[PDB]
Write a protein that binds this DNA or RNA. Structure first.
Ligand SMILES: [Mn+2]
Ligand SMILES: [Mn+2]
Ligand SMILES: [Mn+2]
Ligand SMILES: [Mn+2]
Ligand SMILES: [Mn+2]
Ligand SMILES: [Mn+2]
Ligand SMILES: [Mn+2]
Ligand SMILES: [Mn+2]
Ligand SMILES: [Mn+2]
Ligand SMILES: [Mn+2]
Ligand SMILES: [Mn+2]
Ligand SMILES: [Mn+2]
Ligand SMILES: [Mn+2]
Lengths: 87, 94, 98, 107, 98, 82, 106, 94
DNA sequence: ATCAATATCCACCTGCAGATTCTACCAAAAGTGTATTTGGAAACTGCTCCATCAAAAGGCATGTTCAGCTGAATTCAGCTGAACATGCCTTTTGATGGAGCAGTTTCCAAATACACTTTTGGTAGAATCTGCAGGTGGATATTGAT
DNA sequence: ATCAATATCCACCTGCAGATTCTACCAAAAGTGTATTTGGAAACTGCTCCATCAAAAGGCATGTTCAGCTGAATTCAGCTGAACATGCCTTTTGATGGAGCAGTTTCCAAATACACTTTTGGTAGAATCTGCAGGTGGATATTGAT
């Protein structure tokens, strides 16, 4: 296997309009300019926590592929039970 | 390997309540998660209950108490009647 | 040239998105963020496509519900504009930072 | 012969539920009435959620229940909302709800 | 006639109660309340003494932590006086109301 | 002079709780609000405790019934067994 | 015969932990190392809290650890506080803490 | 009927860490609650891990993963090293 | 800035509720020894589906302009809560019959254990059905300037 | 209150992905039938420790006074929403190699299953031991009026 591009700064892929949309679904009408970076930071923590546990389940099973079930179990452990993906 | 799901039973019940209504596969997946979720919750409450009382057997009585602990008011009442009825009937048939 | 007043379109957007269910973050960008984060935890991982969608459904539900709480915090302060301090108070009361 | 489900008057599988209870390591022993009672409860809760979701589907002029209908059913029902208070229904969206102070005008 | 200004003694009490651990609701009245509530679920019940005490330790720790969140909500609205709407906001975000 | 039981949770007791919670100034309406909140808290915990009491075929609510009730409500308490 | 605890170099009871695991209905079987590993983890966590609790008793000029000290040790320690984030230590009280805006304007 | 607790073992550990420090009854009861609580969380997590992977056995490996899932950073690292050390020592002994 | 009223410390003191030390008893455990049973690792491999490259294009992200109206500041007065002094009723404490929580013994309804026999939920593959996404057009509200 | 610029409602209609429609195969279920085992209901009962009463004991209820907090009214700088031009990059449709997940068989290292010997933690009673909770004394800080 040759090369594999370096992943960096992808938190910026969570754009201002996407965050605005999520806040609209949450019933928000007006948004301070500082909210976007704050939301990215909160999403990163949320994702690090769920992904850490999901990958822990992946390693325990000695797999190299993170499954939908590894995520469902990780979400359940965190009190964020998710229906619809085998869980 | 065969993978089980409550799908056909969910479908049978769907047909009883809403004869001409169908369900998408994603909604059926959600219903299968729901049934498994409640099964585990009730079974786990039953397990703890039996352990707390130093009993090695989970009987319908532990399921009933687990149901009362787990379900909100009116749902617990109706679940209790349906389960009691199902057991009384079951035991009358043999 | 016609112009809706500020807030009018915002309210329209709220009604539109609260009526629908499609994910609101672009899919590939979210998938890259997931891969970047996962990669820093453990190298050479692969992902089932439904594992990434599961993370996205959960992340968006989490954020929408946090914005609802944030909104309540801004309104509590007699504002209609959410600010970082509202998100922080919401997470603190939730026990996410408490 | 007859299934334990038929003897109990249920649609849900008593045999399956008995098996799942044994394999789950909930207790050393599982009595015969346990799976009957449990299958009955699961069946009842599923009847309840499908009753409400099919109504949400009808309300939306649809014949097929989708996740959004399951979510509207659960979130608009006080008890199901509580039972699923920490559950996320994928592709469910949220209930329309705009805080009053955010609406325009007055009165 | 000496007189401490409004707040001076309040602050003094906060310092005092945050240093100690004794229960702050009187026992008998709490016990009566507990028995009365239980009688609605099952009549003619008795209580081990440790059962009532556990309920009081749990109830007090619950209210004290709720008052902390309530206080953050009042402060969020630029007040220093807790009001019912502060307790309501805290409970809603905790998901006890939500 | 009579006295409603929940009223036995007095203004001073509530203020002390609030002080330990870091509260400096209190609205008069807080006391009744607090009583209502405390009653809901006790109803939820006691209901489950009694459910464990009855399942055990007892007439006495034990500390363990309370500990198990608190635990399932996500309010784990240390110091009373379990 | 040497106790499994002594063989593992532990103070906590391996034998009892094995027994508790078996009867807790956690799995059909329990391997030999599981109760040893688990006992060691329980011992270590215990030492950690008693270590910090004892220090709190000391700072308070006390030689006997009481609930207050366990609470001070746990709530002042970032990790223990999170591990016990949903636990109430009876007779623990709270950490001294007054929101700055509430202090008088000296 | 015997009432078992971790009291005597908690006390032995106390003496190793603070030789001249005692512990009150209430505090000890808190420590007993702590040990039972962590035991149950770790055991339950290990139980789920084995079931998820369709294994009938809870081995030191499920205990280890359970620890990494349940304990915060540094606590997990030291618990893992302490656990690994004890199983090593144990395994090397006639 | 100057007392003056109080709260807050700290050094010391000691009775006692609660922790510690010790003897005796033993079912409960836990450890050792023996033989059988078995979960799941390695080994080999079928086959799903994951990563990746390609190409096309339009749904959206980006960046800017402009100004509506929101947040933040300032001011101020009504009035609600804090502090406090005044007086008694509910709570706390210590003592005592029994309601039952438990320990013990008896016994069967009911739950493993085990060998067949029969039924059924999956599911692999091909075929036809059918609800509604998605675009279209036009009559009906909604908004916002005047 | 009229009028235009636009969003919103929505019933109707076509193409299609997703769904309900059958055929055949069946291992994994689930069920029917004897033998053997035993968990725990049931009854009786001893020992706690709970409910309740009496009285020694330590807040709470209540009205007065006013400090200072809340929230109303006012003002305005500039943030943030709305609209717009531009074109990037996500999305969509497909194909392909192959990493690796997952099925199948072999087979031992390690676990279950007693049976037996030993040690040990828990309990009960007796009696001595001790950390520290309050109580005292005097010193000093804190607070608030002057
Ligand atoms: Mn990286
Ligand atoms: Mn095998
Ligand atoms: Mn661009
Ligand atoms: Mn404003
Ligand atoms: Mn007043
Ligand atoms: Mn009796
Ligand atoms: Mn079939
Ligand atoms: Mn449409
Ligand atoms: Mn028996
Ligand atoms: Mn390969
Ligand atoms: Mn001994
Ligand atoms: Mn002292
Ligand atoms: Mn003095």
């Amino acid at each position: 296997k040759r090369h594999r591009k370096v992943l960096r700064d992808n938190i910026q892929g969570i754009t201002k309009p996407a965050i605005r949309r999520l806040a609209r679904r949450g019933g928000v009408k007006r948004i301070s300019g500082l909210i976007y970076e704050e939301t990215r930071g909160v999403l990163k923590v949320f994702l690090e926590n769920v992904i850490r546990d999901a990958v822990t389940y992946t390693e325990h099973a000695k797999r190299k592929t993170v499954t939908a079930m590894d995520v469902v179990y990780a979400l359940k452990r965190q009190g964020r039970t998710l229906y619809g993906f085998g869980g | 390997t065969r993978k089980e799901s409550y799908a056909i039973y969910v479908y049978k019940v769907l047909k009883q309540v809403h004869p001409d209504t169908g369900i998408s596969s994603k909604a059926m997946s959600i219903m299968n998660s729901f049934v498994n979720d409640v099964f585990e919750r009730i079974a786990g409450e039953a397990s703890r209950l039996a352990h707390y009382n130093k009993r090695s057997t989970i009987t319908s009585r532990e399921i009933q108490t687990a149901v009362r602990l787990l379900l909100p008011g009116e749902l617990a009442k109706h679940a209790v009647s349906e389960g009691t009825k199902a057991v009384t009937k079951y035991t009358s048939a043999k | 040239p016609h112009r809706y007043r500020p807030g009018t379109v915002a309210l329209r957007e709220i009604r539109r998105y609260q009526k629908s269910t499609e994910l609101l973050i672009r899919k590939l960008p979210f998938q890259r963020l997931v891969r970047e984060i996962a990669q820093d935890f453990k190298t050479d991982l692969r992902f089932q496509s439904s594992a990434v969608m599961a993370l996205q459904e959960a992340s968006e539900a989490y954020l929408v519900a946090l914005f609802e709480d944030t909104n309540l915090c801004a309104i509590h302060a007699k504002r209609v504009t959410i600010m970082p301090k509202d998100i922080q108070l919401a997470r603190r009361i939730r026990g996410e930072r408490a | 012969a007859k299934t334990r489900s038929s003897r109990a008057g249920l649609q849900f599988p008593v045999g399956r539920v008995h098996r799942l209870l044994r394999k789950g390591n909930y207790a050393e022993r599982v009595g015969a009435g346990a799976p009957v009672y449990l299958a009955a409860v699961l069946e009842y809760l599923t009847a309840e959620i499908l009753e409400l979701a099919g109504n949400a589907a009808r309300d939306n002029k649809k014949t097929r229940i989708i996740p959004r209908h399951l979510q509207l059913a659960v979130r608009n029902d006080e008890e199901l909302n509580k039972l699923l208070g920490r559950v996320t229904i994928a592709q469910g969206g949220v209930l329309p709800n705009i805080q009053s102070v955010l609406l325009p005008k007055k009165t």
